Structure 1
Amino acid sequence: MSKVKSITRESWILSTFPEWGSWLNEEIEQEQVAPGTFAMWWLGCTGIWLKSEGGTNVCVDFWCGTGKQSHGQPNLRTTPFVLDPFAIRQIDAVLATHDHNDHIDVNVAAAVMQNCADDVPFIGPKTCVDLWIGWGVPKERCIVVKPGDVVKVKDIEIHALDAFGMDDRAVNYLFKTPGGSLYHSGDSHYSNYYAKHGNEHQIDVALGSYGENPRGITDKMTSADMLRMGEALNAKVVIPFHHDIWSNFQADPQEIRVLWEMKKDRLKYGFKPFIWQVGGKFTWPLDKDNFEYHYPRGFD
C-alpha cells in the first residue's frame, strides 16, 4: 500500500506534537537543585515551572492552547511546546495569576487531574477557582487567594500580592524558597505598588510581561517599564517574558539591555537584565550575571 497513502493527517500530528515531547519533563525530573539555589524553566508565555532545593515542584501560568487556526486580532502562536502537560508526574501545586486565556488551561488541569496525586492544590484568585471548578476540579482541591494571603507548599512560601473588587480577578506571586525568591507578575501593567512590594520583601529574580503594543492598545509593559519594575522591586535580576507567544506582540528584548546600559550608572540600578529563551533553564544565583541565555549547544 506504500507510505504516501497509508499516512493520514492524524498520524502525522500525533507522532510529531508536542515539539519537545517529554525532553523537558525529564530534564526537570532529573534536576538536582543545590542548597542555596533554585531552578526554573520558561514554559512559554508567562508559564514557569519552579523547583526548590528541597525538591518541591511548582507550576505557574502553564498554558497549552494556541492562537488563530483559521480566518473563519491576528494573534498566532509563535512559540513551540516545550513541556508535555500529560507527562507531568511530580507536582506539588498548580497556580494561576488571573483568568485570562493565556494563563489558565483546561488541558493542564485535565492532565494533572488524571496523572497526579489527589492532593495537588489548584491555587488562584476567586474567578480562577470558579473557572477550575467548572472544568471538573473538585472544590476541595482548590485554594482561593487574595492579596495578603500566604500559602505554604513544603519549603516554598507563596505570597499573594496586588496586581495591576479586583481581588477576585488577579494576583501577583512571590515565591520564597530557601535558595531565593521569585517575583511573578502575570500579564500585569506597570503599577507604583511594585515599590511597596520592594519595600516589604526581598526580591531576587523578577519576571514581567514584555511585548510590543500594537497601535491603540496597552496590554504589555514597555522596555522602559521593565527597568522601572526592577528598580521598584529592588530586584537583582529582571527577566522579560510573554513577548515570545504572540505574532502581533513581537518585541525585541534587547531594548531592555540598551536602555539599561544608558541608565544604570545615572540611576544606580541594583539589578541586571537577562534575556531568556523558551524551554530554557535559569539557576539563581549562578546565572544572575549572564545577561543572555543560550541552549545547550552539544555535550561533546
Structure 2
Amino acid sequence: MSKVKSITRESWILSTFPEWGSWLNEEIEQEQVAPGTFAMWWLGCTGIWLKSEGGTNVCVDFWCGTGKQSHGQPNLRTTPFVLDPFAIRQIDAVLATHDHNDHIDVNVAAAVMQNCADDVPFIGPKTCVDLWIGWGVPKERCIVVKPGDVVKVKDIEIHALDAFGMDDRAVNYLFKTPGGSLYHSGDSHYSNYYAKHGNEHQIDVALGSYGENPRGITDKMTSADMLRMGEALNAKVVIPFHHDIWSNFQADPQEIRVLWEMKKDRLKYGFKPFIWQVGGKFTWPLDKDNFEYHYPRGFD
C-alpha cells in the first residue's frame, strides 16, 4: 500500500477544504477591536462578519454553498472559502437580508446550532425565518424583522430598513456600533429610498451589490449606481461586494474608482470608494482613505 493506492476523492476533499481552514476563524477570534473603531471581514458574496469594540460578533449573509457542479445559467463560484462555519464559536447574532439562495445557508445554520450557544438569535425577514425553522432552527430562537425595527445585540444597534407587503421578503441592515455604522444593502437594486436613509441616519461604511449584468438581466448594481448609492447614503466609504462570487457576473471594481475620479469634484462626492478582497479585514475609520485593500504580505 502506497500513497497512490490509499488516497481517494474523499480523502483529498476532506483534508483540503475549506481552503483557509480556520485561519480567519482564529484571526477574528483574537482580533482586538480598539475603542472608537469597528472591524469587519468579507466572507464572500455578501457575507460579512462584524466585530464591535465591545467584542460583539455579528454575521450577515454568510453563505457556504457553491454554484454549478455539473452540466446535468452557468453560475460557477469563483470565490474560495475563507471561513469555516463549523469552526465558529463566539457569535452573538446570525443575520440574513433576504431568502435568495446565496444569502442564507443551511450549513451555517447547522454549524451555529451544533457548536455555538443556544441564546444566539437568528435575525431576518419572515421568509428567512420560515426557511430557518424548516431546517430545524427552533421558533423561539428566531427574530422576525420588518423595515423600521431596531434590534439591540449587546453594543450593536441593528436597524432593519427597506430593501428593493414586501416587508416579508427583504431588508437592508444598518449596524450601529459605538465606533461607527455599517450599511449592508443585501442584493438590492438601486433605489431612491437610499436618500431617505442618508437623511435619517449617519452612515459611515456602505456595502452594495456590484456586478456585471449579463445581456438582458438586471440583477446587480452598476459602477455608476455604486456612486449614486454612496451619495444618497451620505456615506464616507463605499465598498462593492457580490461581484466576487459568480463567474457570469465577473466585474471590474476599478470602474467605480475611474468614474469616481471623473465625478467627485463636479458632484462634491463626500465619500471614497474602497476595493476589498474576500477574506480581507477592514477597520473603520483607520482604512477609510486606503482606496485598495491588500492581504498581509510580510511576516510582521
Is the TM value for this pair above 0.5?
yes
What TM-score results when the alignment is normalised by the length of structure 1? 1.00
The equivalent residue for 1:294 is 294
- Aligned-residue offset at 1:105: 0.1
Q: Deviations over 1:170-209 (max 9, x none)?
A: 0000000000000000000000000000000000000000
Separation (CA, whole Å) in 1 of partners of 2:89 and 2:38: 20
- Aligned-residue offset at 1:260: 0.1
The equivalent residue for 1:219 is 219
Separation (CA, whole Å) in 2 of partners of 1:240 and 1:102: 16
Q: Deviations over 1:214-256 (max 9, x none)?
A: 0000000000000000000000000000000000000000000
The equivalent residue for 2:201 is 201
Q: Deviations over 1:63-108 (max 9, x none)?
A: 0000000000000000000000000000000000000001000000
SS in structure 1 at match of 2:266: coil
SS in structure 1 at match of 2:228: helix
RMSD (CA atoms): 0.4
Q: Deviations over 1:238-294 (max 9, x none)?
A: 000000000000000000000000000000000000000000000000000000000
Q: Deviations over 1:146-192 (max 9, x none)?
A: 00000000000000000001100000000000000000000000000
- Aligned-residue offset at 1:299: 1.2
The equivalent residue for 2:85 is 85
SS in structure 2 at match of 1:183: strand
The equivalent residue for 2:128 is 128
Separation (CA, whole Å) in 2 of partners of 1:192 and 1:88: 37
Separation (CA, whole Å) in 2 of partners of 1:86 and 1:272: 35
Give the aligned length.
Answer: 300
The equivalent residue for 1:118 is 118
* Gapped regions of structure 2 (runs ≥ 5): none
Separation (CA, whole Å) in 1 of partners of 2:91 and 2:182: 18
Separation (CA, whole Å) in 2 of partners of 1:31 and 1:123: 24
Deviant stretches of 4+, over 6 Å: none
* Gapped regions of structure 1 (runs ≥ 5): none
Q: Deviations over 1:88-132 (max 9, x none)?
A: 000000000000001000000000000000000000000000000
Separation (CA, whole Å) in 2 of partners of 1:120 and 1:244: 29
What TM-score results when the alignment is normalised by the length of structure 2? 1.00
Q: Deviations over 1:22-67 (max 9, x none)?
A: 0000000000000000000000000000000000000000000000
- Aligned-residue offset at 1:298: 1.8
The equivalent residue for 2:62 is 62
Separation (CA, whole Å) in 2 of partners of 1:238 and 1:22: 28
Separation (CA, whole Å) in 2 of partners of 1:64 and 1:136: 18
Separation (CA, whole Å) in 2 of partners of 1:137 and 1:7: 37
Separation (CA, whole Å) in 1 of partners of 2:149 and 2:201: 14
SS in structure 1 at match of 2:206: strand
Separation (CA, whole Å) in 1 of partners of 2:175 and 2:166: 21
Separation (CA, whole Å) in 2 of partners of 1:154 and 1:284: 19
Separation (CA, whole Å) in 1 of partners of 2:3 and 2:274: 47
SS in structure 1 at match of 2:102: coil
